[PDB]
Subunit: 362 residues, 2 copies
């Protein structure tokens, strides 16, 4: 299918910058997720790829062809809206046919296209039914089938599972990955759901504030976060953060809590003159021990079940962090504990810019 390149795409309605210099290539047949919070520009980017919105500047290529000023009809794209719906007085068949009926396609052609997409989406037994007879899951499949009826080269999905209940969501997301695979259709998938992105996507573009902060495989974006926000948006619970000051070659958190600068950062910190850092560590990368030892010291705040374990929330002066603990242990409120983190699993970020500090790669 189509490889898409976005080259220096900017979208400015006026003074608000919706998209700022978006550079991104989605590969032929790839499932790309656009992951970010509300108002990040993730949906705007999708609408810009579709053609519904026009960039202020920059180019959009589908394969060789510049499609930047082409309207959506000419770009051969399929779009499922976030808040998609089927017409209730139309059968499943007519719901899929209607875009072609409106284009005046001959009936023979329409009937053949619907036959084909219905089978692809596993709805060929429901053609005669009305939406009130279908499940949310079945309805979603019809929505997708209708998006393919004009045989597009890209599938664009703006948080489509947002309609469905959270449990069904879990099944349907794996079924959607299977479909994208068998079609080999280039797919761009907008979501605010980190777990969904990590489970479905080939690559994830983490979007923040009109900007692609990072693009990588699940493993890359999770294990090698380039900015604090990237670390903070993935995992449940996500990466913990504690602010520190570089004082006398240590990372000072509290009057009573400080750590050495990991040896791998000593030259970087020294020659950049960085004094204010953010220490990052994931909840599963640390251990709580009771008492004040050497580590990040704080006080037990709360605890809650998570799976077979508990997630223990610890307050560290201003900040709150979460660390997994055995279900059997009892942590009482205000109890003094030390958080042990192996330095190899510690990410350091500049406070001001939130950029990860990276030493010379081995």
């Amino acid at each position: 299918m189509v490889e898409i390149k976005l080259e220096n795409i900017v979208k400015k309605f006026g003074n608000f910058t919706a998209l700022n210099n978006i550079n991104l290539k989605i590969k032929d047949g790839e499932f790309m997720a656009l992951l970010g919070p509300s108002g990040s520009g993730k949906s705007t980017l999708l609408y810009t790829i579709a053609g519904i919105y026009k960039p202020t500047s920059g180019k959009i290529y589908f394969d060789e062809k510049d499609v930047t000023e082409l309207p959506p009809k000419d770009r051969n794209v399929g779009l499922v809206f976030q808040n998609w719906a089927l017409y209730p007085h139309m059968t499943v068949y007519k719901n899929i046919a209607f875009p072609l009926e409106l284009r005046k396609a001959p009936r023979e052609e329409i009937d053949k296209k619907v036959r084909e997409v219905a089978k692809m989406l596993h709805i060929d037994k429901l053609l005669n039914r009305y939406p009130w007879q279908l499940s949310g899951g079945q309805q979603q499949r019809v929505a997708i089938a209708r998006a393919l009826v004009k045989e597009p080269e890209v599938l664009l999905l703006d948080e489509p599972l947002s309609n469905l209940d959270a449990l069904l969501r879990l099944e349907v997301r794996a079924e959607l990955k299977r479909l994208q695979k068998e079609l080999g259709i280039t797919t761009v998938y907008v979501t605010h759901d980190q777990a969904e992105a990590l489970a479905m996507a080939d690559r994830i573009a983490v979007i923040r504030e009109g900007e692609i902060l990072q693009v990588g495989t699940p493993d890359e974006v999770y294990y090698k976060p380039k900015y604090k926000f990237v670390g903070g948006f993935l995992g449940n619970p996500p990466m913990n953060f504690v602010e520190a000051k570089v004082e006398d070659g240590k990372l000072v958190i509290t009057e009573k809590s400080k750590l050495p600068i990991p040896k791998q950062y000593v030259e970087i910190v020294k020659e950049t003159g960085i004094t204010e850092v953010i220490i990052g560590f994931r909840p599963h990368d640390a251990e709580i021990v009771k008492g004040e030892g050497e580590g990040i010291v704080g006080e037990v705040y709360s605890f809650e079940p998570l799976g077979r374990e508990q997630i223990v929330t610890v307050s560290v002066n201003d900040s709150i962090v979460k660390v997994f603990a055995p279900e059997g242990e009892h942590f009482s409120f205000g109890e003094k504990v030390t958080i042990k983190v192996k330095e190899e699993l510690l990410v350091l970020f500049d406070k001001k810019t939130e950029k990860a500090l990276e030493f010379s790669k081995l």
Copy 2:
């Protein structure tokens, strides 16, 4: 079916397309016919099919002389190199058509078409037209259509010609699984050295209407029987340097001389051969800066090939290619010595181009 080709000759008047071919293709085996354009490899495939008849010689399927019989009556499934689907026919009809031409009943047509479609993983494509399929999908329809009359032998003339580099490297593996899945005797024409080595149980190397060698990938690669065999497998293939035998030395130039490789002294002197071809593979030799021990030459050109460098080196009148570390720096005219361990040198008779044999270890 086990296929025996017996003294096959094919002449188009004054041109000898096939010159005394003797080949046994075993029951259930994947046989590659490997050679360059114009080698006779396709003419041979068409002679196995029955579209061409031998000028003289016989073809047996199991024990039956099928020489005079057409393809249909031999139960061959043939896929042409420039195969094509009818564009106004659905995938279903395209597959059905040979059965419809044979006046087959409805139930037979539908059962065979749907069954072959499943086996070729094209059953979801049955109502689409050829223009709607990818090249890969269209190639599977072609194979399916060849299998729909229950062939005893599958004959494939470089069909994958249409597919892109990357897609082809995996679709060959696929074809090989299907062939093993069905256990159908399969003969596969290709000019592609790498493909034949990856796919075939045995490879017949064809040049100028003759089979030079039939063997496993290891046999034809590691134990080539003719210069051309060594010259046609590998990328790059085997290097050849001509030499004169003088007093236990092989003389390439006044500058380049080497002892007759110790394994070959007996057969070279026994026969009184005065010239030979020295063959060695690009990966079986090391380029060393300066003149010294071995075949000396001068750098001609170099380019990347994988995580390595392939260096073209001029050995006076001729050219050889040898691999080197990607970080090393060579330049035109640079004097080098190509170190070749005698264990990995082969010698061929200059006249017959046949490998010389020494007493076997």
